[PDB]
Design a protein around this ligand. Sequence first.
Ligand SMILES: CC(=O)N[C@@H]1[C@@H](O)[C@H](O[C@@H]2O[C@H](CO)[C@@H](O[C@@H]3O[C@H](CO[C@H]4O[C@H](CO)[C@@H](O)[C@H](O)[C@@H]4O[C@@H]4O[C@H](CO)[C@@H](O)[C@H](O)[C@H]4NC(C)=O)[C@@H](O)[C@H](O[C@H]4O[C@H](CO)[C@@H](O)[C@H](O)[C@@H]4O[C@@H]4O[C@H](CO)[C@@H](O)[C@H](O)[C@H]4NC(C)=O)[C@@H]3O)[C@H](O)[C@H]2NC(C)=O)[C@@H](CO)O[C@H]1O
Ligand SMILES: [Ca+2]
Length: 129
Amino acid sequence: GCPDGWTQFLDLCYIYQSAKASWASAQSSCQALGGILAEPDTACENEVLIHMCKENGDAGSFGPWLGGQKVGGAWQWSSSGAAFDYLRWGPNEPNNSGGNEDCLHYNWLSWNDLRCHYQASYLCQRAAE
Ligand SMILES: CC(=O)N[C@@H]1[C@@H](O)[C@H](O[C@@H]2O[C@H](CO)[C@@H](O[C@@H]3O[C@H](CO[C@H]4O[C@H](CO)[C@@H](O)[C@H](O)[C@@H]4O[C@@H]4O[C@H](CO)[C@@H](O)[C@H](O)[C@H]4NC(C)=O)[C@@H](O)[C@H](O[C@H]4O[C@H](CO)[C@@H](O)[C@H](O)[C@@H]4O[C@@H]4O[C@H](CO)[C@@H](O)[C@H](O)[C@H]4NC(C)=O)[C@@H]3O)[C@H](O)[C@H]2NC(C)=O)[C@@H](CO)O[C@H]1O
Ligand SMILES: [Ca+2]
């Protein structure tokens, strides 16, 4: 079971929220919905979020926040501290442009590193009931 207006995949529920929110603000928003920024650590979870991005007309540059973060030099999922294993970086990413690209988001439907105060839409996940 997933809540109404959310998209189901295996044991997860996702939702796209149109916003102009920093990564931190987006996290706070997902937490109020009982969830977290989406952490697509499998190829198929990414395909589902990508489909949602296309559905919401957010398939180009400065696509939505995801829950990956760069702590020091290490790319990891926020909720778990897990180092990225499966990767979905876009071509020539990550590139750390301007030196402060410490948050994960979709850029042209691929992962990119972006400055965390950039204002974007966001994707949340929660456990299915
Ligand atoms: C109001 C006003 O006038 N404001 C302007 C303000 O717009 C402007 O900011 C610049 O805006 C432009 C236009 O949106 C930006 O250009 C696009 O950037 C996106 C975002 O990704 C880049 O930027 C972020 C940082 O913000 C960074 O995290 C990413 O890594 C990426 O940086 C770039 O990485 C490249 C490798 O990935 C490097 O080689 C670059 O040097 C590096 N850029 C920087 C700034 O360091 C980006 O996605 C866009 O790229 C698409 O479009 C171009 C042109 O068509 C293509 O050449 C690209 O290949 C890419 O196209 C897409 O590529 C996909 C695969 O990658 C394909 O799947 C897609 O189909 C294809 N899509 C299309 C439509 O062809 C742009 O490059 C830019 O970042 C802003 N800043 C700068 C400095 O340019 C500022 C700046 O002057 O001025 C204000 O006045
Ligand atoms: Ca980048």
